[PDB]
Amino acid sequence: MACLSRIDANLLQYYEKPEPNNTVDLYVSGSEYSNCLLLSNSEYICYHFSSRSTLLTFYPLSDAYHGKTINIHLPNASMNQRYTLTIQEVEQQLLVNVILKDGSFLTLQLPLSFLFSSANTLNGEWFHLQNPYDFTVRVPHFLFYVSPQFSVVFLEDGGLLGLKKVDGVHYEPLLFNDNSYLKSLTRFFSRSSKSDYDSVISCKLFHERYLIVLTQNCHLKIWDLTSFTLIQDYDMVSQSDSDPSHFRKVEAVGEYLSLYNNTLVTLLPLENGLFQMGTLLVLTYTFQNNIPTNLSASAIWSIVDLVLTRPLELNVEASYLNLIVLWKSGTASKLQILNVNDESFKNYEWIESVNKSLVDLQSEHDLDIVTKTGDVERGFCNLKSRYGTQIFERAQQILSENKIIMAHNEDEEYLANLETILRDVKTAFNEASSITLYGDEIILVNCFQPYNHSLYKLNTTVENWFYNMHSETDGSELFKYLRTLNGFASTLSNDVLRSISKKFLDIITGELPDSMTTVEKFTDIFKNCLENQFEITNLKILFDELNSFDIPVVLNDLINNQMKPGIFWKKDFISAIKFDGFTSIISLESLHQLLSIHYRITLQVLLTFVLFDLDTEIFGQHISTLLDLHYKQFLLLNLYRQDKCLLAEVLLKDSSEFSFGVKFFNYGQLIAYIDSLNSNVYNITENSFFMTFFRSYIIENTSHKNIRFFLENVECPFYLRHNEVQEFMFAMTLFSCGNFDQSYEIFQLHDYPEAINDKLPTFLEDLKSENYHGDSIWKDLLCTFTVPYRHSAFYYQLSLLFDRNNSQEFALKCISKSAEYSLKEIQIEELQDFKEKQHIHYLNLLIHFRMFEEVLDVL
Amino acid sequence: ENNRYIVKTLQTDYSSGFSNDDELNGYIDMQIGYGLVNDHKKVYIWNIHSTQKDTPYITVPFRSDDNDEIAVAPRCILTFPATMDESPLALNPNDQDETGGLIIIKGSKAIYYEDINSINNLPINSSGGEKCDLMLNCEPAGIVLSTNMGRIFFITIRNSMGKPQLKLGKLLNKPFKLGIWSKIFNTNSSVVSLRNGPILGKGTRLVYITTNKGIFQTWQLSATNSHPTKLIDVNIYEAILESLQDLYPFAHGTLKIWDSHPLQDESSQLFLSSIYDSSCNETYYILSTIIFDSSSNSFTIFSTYRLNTFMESITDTKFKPKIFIPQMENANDTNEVTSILVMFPNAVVITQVNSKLDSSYSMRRKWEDIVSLRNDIDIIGSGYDSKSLYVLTKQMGVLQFFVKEVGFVKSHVDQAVYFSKINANPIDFNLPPEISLDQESIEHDLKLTSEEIFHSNGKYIPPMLNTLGQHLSVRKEFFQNFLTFVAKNFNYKISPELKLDLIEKFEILNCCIKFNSIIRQSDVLNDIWEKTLSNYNLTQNEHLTTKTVVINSPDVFPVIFKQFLNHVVFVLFPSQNQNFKLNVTNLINLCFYDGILEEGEKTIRYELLELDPMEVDTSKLPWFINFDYLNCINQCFFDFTFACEEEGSLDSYKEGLLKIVKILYYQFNQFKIWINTQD
């Protein structure tokens, strides 16, 4: 059934400021709405219009953090709201048509070179005031851009009025004689009340001619703008299953019409339970069925947009249209998708949205077993990033980025808001407002507040499971397998399962040694942490529940098609310029949704061969791969919560395919792009290492800027080549931070058959270049001790650097190494750099301690 | 008898708002159950789950004044826009559909919560001081502000992002002026003093009210248009009254001072009528289950009146009669969903009945007096969670108690009381209906029970050879336990012409039997010719077989027991078969000694004041004066003294010193007189 789910967004989690990068009050002389603009440059202005009706944010959607962010302050408010706000580009410059409330009309011009790159370069007048027709005493509530030669204004007093431009800037009235002064009183219409006009609440075009406004009382009045006369009048109190004796007439301007093909939709409240989809054709208006929606929350959902689009990659790839019906109701929102699978709108495939976060599904099914989170003195790095700095710094300081205000304590406004801001995890800046189709077909709900979105994404059929699992029937017999394995796992507490997951770290490390059968390992697991922490009924229940699914074939499906990708690859990624917040959230959060799900999948399957001695060497492929996957999993669950500043960038870093941002326009692109970075984490199941690649570089970068969760991404068994190079970079982990006795030891502990041959790719970040260590500090300095040595050419490299960033004892003590533990001491002048220079550097660090021997027979 | 009852433990909750666990009221709504114990800081409302600490788990505090102004458990609610079930799926998203509100008792200031978890952001609402009693939710997203003047000021919330609007609903001064009915609650809960049925019964977006006299109104509120719309105001006090009297008889001056008080409405399908006359000190009840057939909320004759055989006897502390049923939708049977009636004053769980004139019976699980007292029971508030019974018990966390005369004294004493005394521990519900079938006085329910339930340890263990061998020991503690049940609940002391202390004297003459049946030498063959005279048999190796007949009857059987002691003959003068006679001596001669140490610890003045009145009656062989039987313990006197001129001076000192041990229990009829100076 259902595939798409939320991923919530705040783009101040990727940075440490609680507020937008910059904001510039650029004067013309914010929360309520956000609809983007379709532009031909494929990077879209995200026009958030406020409730205040006079502030209006223009900033790149992708390129969001960087670029240029401008709020215009209109000198007086817009005539109603966003309904008198029509934006499109007419000359490579965004023409922002506004009815100013007092009497006039406005046109602004804003370039795609001063919104989409840093600083201002637009100057002189760009705000043009003109009064084509009197709007002082004629009041419209709706502006309709039709053409770049017609953005016709609909008055509530008068008729319908054409307002044709003649150069793009200045307008001339071309009055229509369509009805809104021949009606608005007739016999179900009222001009003595804000309710009940024949004037607009939502108009759509049908073919550059025919014009089908929906009215307050839901009338599709079909006009023809070559003749200005009525074509067909419809009234949906009789084109419906709805009578006017329980109809909620619409009493406010609002969105209810949508199209992308034929499918003209009118929803009708009657206590917000029967949706309606109709159809229009070149008039003749057909009616089919009313769809009972699945709703919740007493049906106090209010609709703010509905669009639809051409078929999408889901669990299904085929349908007819996805009516993108967007609800919201205070702090929460939901995208229920009435995905009709044909012109029959009685057939459907419902697609629920979780209204809560990615990490609010993990405190309501539990997977915070792998929280490694700080307190409030390490809260300044980790609680900073779990909510955003934005939520973290504030606690009732936020009063209109979530639209929950305060009054006083004899009221229930202060108390309420106080509670709501620290319950906000990433939810309730996602007060869903409107949708646009970024690229071609990306279902991009842009919410109330700039720099927060509801990111709908492919999420994928395998990225549901655990969090949705009794509402979906997607996946196979494998779905049903893992659901019967919640008949074990979920009955028990998962902190029991946390320690059983600990004993699986221990299989890789070797406290439980690897040179045994995994039968024998798992019965030693059965002594420890699963010893009357079975229930005896959970035992017998899991047993028959296994055997009813054919085990090697359902493992075969799982491990080789899901939690191992194949090679996924650059299938035409066009990229955004600059590391920014909006492309960092693509590369971190959907990724983690795939990784921590595979952690509870690995947990879940390696619980069921604890309790039986049926061979796990028939499962010898499957079980080893699941433990190798577990330990690379475990790395990235101890650093997701800690930093959302860090880790996005590092899986950006690992191919120049991902550059430092990706602009995905479809799902051929994005199924491939998340299945790249999944394969990178899981380095298949070793196709290189990325506790070498991902790590060494960012140790020299940001463990010098002092992230110390790198004792939670150290983690290697240190068998194979680990015990050469990981010994090298875990030494350098605390060399970056300047904790110096660990650097002294774990550098010198391994030998080095390393010379200049390279198996440490290390880049000392100079902060302007890579000082290329392991090759081009090796071919320099170990070669000016003349022939690399197996100890102490390295232990000059320790020693020299160790004085350089201060640590005279630990340095002295590794050149008191390299003096004596010179391998050439025949005293000849081509190896009297290896026992010359290393004898001079020895004597340097003894005369500031002022000694007693050590100048004996070395003077 | 335990029927369909499931009674054990559920769990014990998360504690920061179960920090308080005082017995009070608890706000329950049919949704999936929410639980409450009020606290004096906050009104911590939880949702019950069997992952028991916080994982699924809602424990959300909601505001309450920390002042002299305060709240009580029914005065904080969970507001549903359109009363109707959708409160799940806010448990982690935190949607608008489960808000709440409190308007203060004397202050009348709203703190109206805009969400479940966002409470920082409150609105104030008014009708002024003293317009209060408790809060309930209604349909516009509204809140019922009930007043105990009988008024409800209908406080229409705008449903967008909450925000109440002050106005005065239906009812104004109309029932202010009535003092000729009581509107004042002596029973509280928002399920008890009021009910807004979500789908429960005929309720479904219907605010109800029933006052302590049965003054029953119904509104409906139309969420769109924001208006209380009255649909009835009828007294169901006239509905019930007449046939309250035509069941339990009230005499002229009993009527004159008598009250009926409708103590409950279960969505206007149940009304708990307290028939009580103020001179007695027992609240009797009639369960007037009013189901409507056809048109609803008005007078029917399926108003029907179930005379209780349950009696409550008042306690003025721990008083709060309340009825919470999960499935009170039923006028016709089910017996695998919970739909049993429960009364409780707050220390017990009374499994009672309903729908017994709504349909033709319904086979419901037992009525009458039913207790629970298993360990530290005291009821903060029953409820219903996931459509099954919830009972929030005080110091045991939550306990589940959910459920999914003649002849019981005459031969179903041997089935049904056999059942109510062979267990009583795991579920204790079985002891009141059965042992007060016994205990209630008829002349043949107290004379003959004390004989025939003493044959129900004659049936202990359903096998009759497990229990006559090596669980004849375990059968011995169940003689004693069975008569523990007798003694605590008064069936002994009412007696036929036959002695009633036969039951006592046989557990003196048990200790010989038990000694033989565990310790085996060759004194297990004693019980041979004993048995095989009385009934002709299997006639085999055993005649430890068919001892379940010998069990509970020391009449003629001690006679015949002694005969295989007299079967040990042929020539015994030079000593040899005297080893046999030693072995006989060593066990059962201490057991005829006993009945001085086993009739010291008990019967001293249950067997002089009923033994000697029963000695007067004899015919000879009938057991009376015989007390170990005249002319059979004299030939066993002469068996040991004849043994001692068939043997030496050593085996002979043993068998001899233990003959003149036992010369006093053919005295112990009138030698209970020792501590005292008395056909």
GROMACS .gro file of C-alpha atoms in nm, chain A residues 248 271 295-301 328-334 355-356 360-366 395 403-406 408-423 490-491, chain B residues 51 54-56 61 63 80-82 86 89-97 100-102 109-124 141 159-161 163-164 205 223-225:
model
   96
  248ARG     CA    1  -2.012   2.338   0.466
  271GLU     CA    2  -1.716   1.790   0.838
  295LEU     CA    3  -0.786   1.104   0.837
  296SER     CA    4  -0.731   1.146   1.202
  297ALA     CA    5  -0.736   1.411   1.463
  298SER     CA    6  -1.115   1.460   1.477
  299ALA     CA    7  -1.094   1.578   1.111
  300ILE     CA    8  -0.977   1.927   1.197
  301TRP     CA    9  -0.738   1.913   0.901
  328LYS     CA   10  -0.224   2.053   0.833
  329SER     CA   11  -0.377   2.116   1.178
  330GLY     CA   12  -0.159   2.308   1.428
  331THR     CA   13   0.189   2.169   1.519
  332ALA     CA   14   0.121   1.856   1.297
  333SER     CA   15   0.063   1.794   0.929
  334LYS     CA   16   0.010   1.496   0.706
  355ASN     CA   17   0.340   1.317   1.091
  356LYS     CA   18   0.637   1.287   1.316
  360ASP     CA   19   1.032   1.042   1.660
  361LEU     CA   20   0.977   0.706   1.512
  362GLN     CA   21   1.268   0.583   1.719
  363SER     CA   22   1.123   0.687   2.056
  364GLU     CA   23   0.796   0.517   1.957
  365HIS     CA   24   0.940   0.191   1.847
  366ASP     CA   25   1.278   0.232   2.009
  395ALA     CA   26   1.260   2.755   2.475
  403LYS     CA   27   0.291   2.990   1.505
  404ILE     CA   28   0.222   2.924   1.867
  405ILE     CA   29   0.197   3.243   2.071
  406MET     CA   30   0.184   3.348   2.430
  408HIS     CA   31  -0.020   3.520   3.000
  409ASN     CA   32  -0.040   3.248   3.263
  410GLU     CA   33  -0.407   3.302   3.351
  411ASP     CA   34  -0.445   3.205   2.996
  412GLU     CA   35  -0.341   2.875   2.845
  413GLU     CA   36  -0.111   3.038   2.586
  414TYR     CA   37   0.210   3.076   2.789
  415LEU     CA   38   0.209   2.725   2.930
  416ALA     CA   39   0.124   2.572   2.599
  417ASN     CA   40   0.397   2.738   2.401
  418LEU     CA   41   0.656   2.663   2.676
  419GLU     CA   42   0.586   2.293   2.635
  420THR     CA   43   0.570   2.289   2.253
  421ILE     CA   44   0.913   2.443   2.174
  422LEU     CA   45   1.123   2.184   2.374
  423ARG     CA   46   0.901   1.890   2.247
  490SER     CA   47   0.929  -0.640   2.023
  491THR     CA   48   0.770  -0.845   2.302
  910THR     CA   49   0.605  -0.262   2.760
  913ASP     CA   50   0.876   0.440   2.865
  914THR     CA   51   0.920   0.305   2.504
  915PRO     CA   52   0.558   0.333   2.353
  920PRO     CA   53   0.168   1.590   3.275
  922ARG     CA   54  -0.135   2.166   3.416
  939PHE     CA   55  -1.173   1.516   2.146
  940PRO     CA   56  -1.296   1.726   1.865
  941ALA     CA   57  -1.598   1.511   1.768
  945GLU     CA   58  -0.908   0.887   1.686
  948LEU     CA   59  -0.163   0.843   1.650
  949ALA     CA   60  -0.072   1.142   1.862
  950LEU     CA   61   0.121   0.908   2.077
  951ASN     CA   62   0.449   1.017   1.910
  952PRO     CA   63   0.348   1.268   1.643
  953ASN     CA   64   0.164   1.483   1.903
  954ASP     CA   65  -0.129   1.585   1.672
  955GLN     CA   66  -0.435   1.801   1.758
  956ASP     CA   67  -0.700   1.559   1.848
  959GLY     CA   68  -0.748   1.906   2.725
  960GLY     CA   69  -0.867   2.183   2.958
  961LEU     CA   70  -0.928   2.285   3.319
  968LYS     CA   71  -0.981   3.062   3.468
  969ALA     CA   72  -0.916   2.818   3.178
  970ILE     CA   73  -0.582   2.679   3.110
  971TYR     CA   74  -0.661   2.542   2.772
  972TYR     CA   75  -0.395   2.326   2.626
  973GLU     CA   76  -0.337   2.367   2.256
  974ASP     CA   77  -0.178   2.020   2.220
  975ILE     CA   78  -0.100   1.706   2.411
  976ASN     CA   79   0.271   1.789   2.456
  977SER     CA   80   0.268   2.171   2.374
  978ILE     CA   81   0.131   2.339   2.674
  979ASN     CA   82   0.377   2.631   2.701
  980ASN     CA   83   0.162   2.807   2.448
  981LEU     CA   84  -0.278   2.967   2.843
  982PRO     CA   85  -0.612   3.112   2.705
  983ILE     CA   86  -0.850   3.216   2.985
 1000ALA     CA   87  -1.366   2.067   2.029
 1018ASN     CA   88  -1.137   2.435   1.624
 1019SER     CA   89  -0.841   2.553   1.428
 1020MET     CA   90  -0.546   2.576   1.668
 1022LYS     CA   91  -0.861   2.882   2.171
 1023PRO     CA   92  -1.188   2.885   2.375
 1064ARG     CA   93  -2.171   1.237   1.981
 1082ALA     CA   94  -1.941   2.111   1.554
 1083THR     CA   95  -1.993   2.330   1.240
 1084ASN     CA   96  -2.255   2.554   1.390
   0.00000   0.00000   0.00000
